[PDB]
Amino acid sequence: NGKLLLAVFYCLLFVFSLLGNSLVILVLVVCKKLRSITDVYLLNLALSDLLFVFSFPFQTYYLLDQWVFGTVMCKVVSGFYYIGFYSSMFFITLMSVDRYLAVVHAVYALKVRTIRMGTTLCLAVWLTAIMATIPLLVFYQVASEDGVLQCYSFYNQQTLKWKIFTNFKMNILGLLIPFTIFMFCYIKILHQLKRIRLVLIVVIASLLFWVPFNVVLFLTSLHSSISQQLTYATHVTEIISFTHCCVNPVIYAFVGEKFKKHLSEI
Amino acid sequence: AYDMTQTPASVEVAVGGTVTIKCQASQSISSYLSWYQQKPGQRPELLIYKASTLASGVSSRFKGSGSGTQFTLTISDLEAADAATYYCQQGYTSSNIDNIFGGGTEVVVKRTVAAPSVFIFPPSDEQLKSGTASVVCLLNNFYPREAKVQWKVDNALQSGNSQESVTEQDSKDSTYSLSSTLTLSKADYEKHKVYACEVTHQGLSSPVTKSFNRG
Amino acid sequence: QSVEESGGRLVTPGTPLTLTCTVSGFSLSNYAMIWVRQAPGEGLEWVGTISLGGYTYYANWAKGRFTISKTSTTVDLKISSPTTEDTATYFCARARWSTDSAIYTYAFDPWGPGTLVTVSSASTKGPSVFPLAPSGTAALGCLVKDYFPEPVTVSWNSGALTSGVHTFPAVLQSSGLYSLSSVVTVPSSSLGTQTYICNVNHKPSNTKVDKKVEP
């Protein structure tokens, strides 16, 4: 009966994440014109979180009953999930790089920090996320396990290599490179500043949310009795990760003063 | 691409014996083979899927094994009702496929030899009036299927004007029946006097003749 | 769960045909449907498959000549231009395990009672029934001759008699018309007391015959 409890939890996440992201977008688009470069990345991060938010109801209706939406929806929902993951993971790296460039290279910062750079980098990030997601979708489809429908990805013994390729692609692209960029930037920023906390907290949260998922995926790729606890681990890690979209608006409303100035009014 | 070949075309086995049927694929399939049974004059029925798991309602005497390329089906305790045709089917892929089924293997239940009973039927009056004469001779309740029949008119042999029909193996007694019909023109019927059907089968020491004279 | 086939007919070579497969007890959105064909006295031959979403997959020989469609309750197979080699029994089956792209589509259950399709330029004809009268035990029967197309159903005493009744398969004559015989063996003493009537029924020409055999 755990599926019902998981569905209720997904509904809770849906409601809170939708409210938070809607409020963030509302403030950014009504009480400001995104004049600052910092605001464009926040807007794109909120638009990425909404992609996670939109995939919850299908999962809730899948835990109860079964998958009745067909194959096109089976591909599209997974596309939403993976594009959201990749885009939200890259935008944090962009924020970290921007903060480093300001704190350390302030003299040269004035030239780069313009609206055009933000727009171009955001478009590039979105295209990169979509391209990185394309390989996964081609294998998702609907299957009938004796009359019960399910949306899942199936590989033959010939195409099985792409499963390993995609697992390692996810790992290296979405964890190591972002983590390395954070490591390089924030040691220097702390060195300069100790003698801001917002983006540091953002990265640590968004890394601890996804690191168990990446670790379990790494173990799964290496494997390809351990199966049962590995399946339980990946299942729990999915929920562990899901909360990043809900908490990002929480962080931005808690820390940023600009958010408070326009949230207290409403 | 994936060509399914069943090795034994026909296997003969006594009751209470073991039957092994082998199926093979040109390319490896990761244990996605199903087995179907078809008794004569009936729709097929599923026996095993995934090459090992029994379908609900099927006895435990059927055991499927193998994986990859080779596959096997074993019938442990054969019964007189197990005479049928078995097909192996690959559920791996459906793209660029000539046929997903195998050639089919036929199981014939062995039995003690039983000589046929011979009957002779001359043409009726109505058919003779119509303009064609048919003389029938019937072999009943014999085993095995290799029975031979010859027609003789006035002690002379005939060929090319006789047709034979054989039933499927009985599911209760495992015997056979055969019927041979000789067709003659109405005029030719009266040109001769004595007709005979002679039967040779392993159950008889010498050929047995059944004959009649017009009248 | 049940599947019933319909549409079997005698169709001239070149005019399109269409068969239907009605379903009861389950929803078509959850299972895939398989079409198979079997020539008289030969093995199964897969022709096509329709998956959950309505994607059709055909065998290499069947590409371009057949087309499968589905609806809420029925599945249709259309033959665009039948040839004389398309005569066979067509079966309609449900795949319990399947994928939307037709991989891993192994377990077929239940099957349907196949529908017989014949293609030829010969017109339908009604059977001619003649009595093979008797001469331990005695044998007597009815000979059905020169009918077309298949099938013809023969019973004895309107189904009251069923023990020891042999009905041989139809054999195609030189004239293109089938022939068949039905024989029953009975105690000799019963010949003079009971009456035996052969009931012949030919659906294509709507022919009913009740012929009594008397020595």
Numbering used by the authors:
A (entry chain C): 33 to 227, 237 to 265, 273 to 314
B (entry chain B): 1 to 215
C (entry chain A): 2 to 136, 143 to 222
Question: What are the paper's exact sentences on this?
Answer:
The C-C motif chemokine receptor 8 (CCR8) is a class A G protein-coupled receptor (GPCR) that is highly enriched and selectively expressed on intratumoral regulatory T (Treg) cells, which act as suppressors of anti-tumor effector T cell responses. CCR8 is part of the ten-member C-C motif chemokine receptor (CCR) subfamily of chemokine receptors. We then determine the structures of the fragment–antigen binding region of mAb1 (Fab1) bound to CCR8 and of the CCL1-CCR8-Gi signaling complex to provide key molecular insights into mAb1-mediated inhibition and CCL1-mediated activation of CCR8, thereby expanding our understanding of this pharmaceutical target. Here, our structural characterization of CCR8 bound to either an antagonist antibody or its endogenous agonist CCL1 revealed distinct chemokine-receptor engagement and activation features and rationalized how distinct antibody binding modes can inhibit CCR8 function.
We formed a stable and monodisperse complex between full-length human CCR8 and Fab1 and obtained a three-dimensional reconstruction by single-particle cryogenic electron microscopy (cryo-EM) with a nominal global resolution of 3.1 Å. The overall complex resembles a table lamp with shade, with Fab1 sitting atop the extracellular region of CCR8, which adopts the canonical class A GPCR fold characterized by a seven transmembrane helical bundle and limited extracellular regions. Comparison of both CCR8 structures indicate that in the Fab1-bound structure, the ECLs 1-2 and the intracellular loops (ICLs) 1-2 are well resolved, while the N-terminus, ECL3 and ICL3 are disordered. Fab1 forms an extensive, mostly electrostatic, interaction interface with the ECLs 1 and 2 of CCR8 that is mainly mediated by its CDRH3, with additional contributions from CDRH1, CDRH2, CDRL1, and CDRL3 (∼650 Å2). The first and main interaction interface is mediated by a continuous stretch of six residues in CDRH3 which forms numerous polar interactions with residues in the first β-strand and the β-turn of the ECL2a β-hairpin. These interactions create an antiparallel β-strand pairing, similar to what was observed in the structure of human 5-hydroxytryptamine 2B (5-HT2B) receptor bound to an extracellular antibody, unlike any other structures of class A GPCRs in complex with a Fab engaging the receptor extracellular loops. The Fab1-CCR8 interaction interface is further stabilized by additional polar interactions between CDRH3, CDRL1, CDRL3, and the ECL2b region at a second interface. Notably, Fab1 does not interact with the CCR8 N-terminus or ECL3, which are not resolved in our structure, in agreement with our flow cytometry experiments. MAb1 inhibits CCL1 agonism of CCR8, but binds at an angle that positions the majority of the Fab away from the central cavity and limits the steric clash with CRS1, used by CCL1 for binding.
